[PDB]
Amino acid sequence: SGRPMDNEEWFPLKQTHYPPPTIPSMKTGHPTGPISIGHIIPDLRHLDNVINCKGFEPFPPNMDVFTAHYEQCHFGDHLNSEFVVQAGLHSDRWEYDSVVEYAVYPTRQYIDRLLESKEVRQYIQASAALLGGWCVYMVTGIMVARGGGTTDFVCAIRLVKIAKSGLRSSWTMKKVTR
């Protein structure tokens, strides 16, 4: 199965097998699946919880969804049998047959518009008033697994961190790793 899919850029969704959204519904801002590109989540410990669950802005023409197909994939890389024995430390790998990555590169304009939707704006304002600043994570990619080892499901997500603290005026976006 080569190298595992759970890279440092991809957080695996292992709580519940959420079904994927249709490809056109991702660009329209009203996805059919509960987890899609363009969704804002509060923190890394609530990957399922979506702030803009009612809908978000449709993808502008400078934001097309790109694909990457992989076959005979597995999910491990977390203290494998070989790494444990040669590190002195002391998991059943799942084998999927078709895994597709859907990815998008966000523009600052699209983020500026997303930070103005009612739900995201309210969360940001509450976090700014009660806490120091605010911090949200945008789903920039989704990994959907077809088949198992039956229905397709979003198996991973790729995020970007948008933040504004220290009373600064401009928000900053940064890639997240694990």
Binders of a copy of itself among residues 26 to 65 (CB under 8 A) are 27, 42-46, 48-51, 53, 62-65
b/e per residue 80-95 (b: at least 16 CB within 10 A): eeeeeeeeeeeeeeee
Taking CA atoms, 159 is separated from 83, 98, 178, in Å, by 27, 22, 11
The 152-171 site mask, x for binding a copy of itself (CB under 8 A), equals --------x-----xx-x--
- Residue 4 as a binder of a copy of itself (CB under 8 A): the answer is yes
Q: How many residues does the chain have?
A: 178
Q: How near is the Cβ of 48 to a copy of itself at its closest, in Å?
A: 7
Q: Comparing C-alpha atoms, which of 160, 163, 165, 169 is closest to residue 137?
A: 160
Among 14, 58, 60, 80, interactor with a copy of itself by CB under 8 A = 80
Among 58, 122, 149, 151, interactor with a copy of itself by CB under 8 A = 122
Beta strands 94-103 and 172-175, pairing class: unpaired
Residue 120 or 153 having the CB closest to a copy of itself: 120
Among 127, 146, 148, 163, interactor with a copy of itself by CB under 8 A = 127
Q: If binding means CB under 8 A, how many residues of this protein chain bind a copy of itself? A: 86
Residue 33 or 106 having the CB closest to a copy of itself: 106
The 82-121 site mask, x for binding a copy of itself (CB under 8 A), equals xxxxxxxxxxxx-x-----xxxxxxxx---------xx-x
140 Rama class: left (phi>0) / alpha (psi -120 to 50) / beta:
alpha
Residue type, 168: R
Q: How near is the Cβ of 151 to a copy of itself at its closest, in Å?
A: 19
Q: Are 124 and 87 in contact (CB under 8 A)?
A: no
DSSP run (H or E) holding 172:
strand 172-175
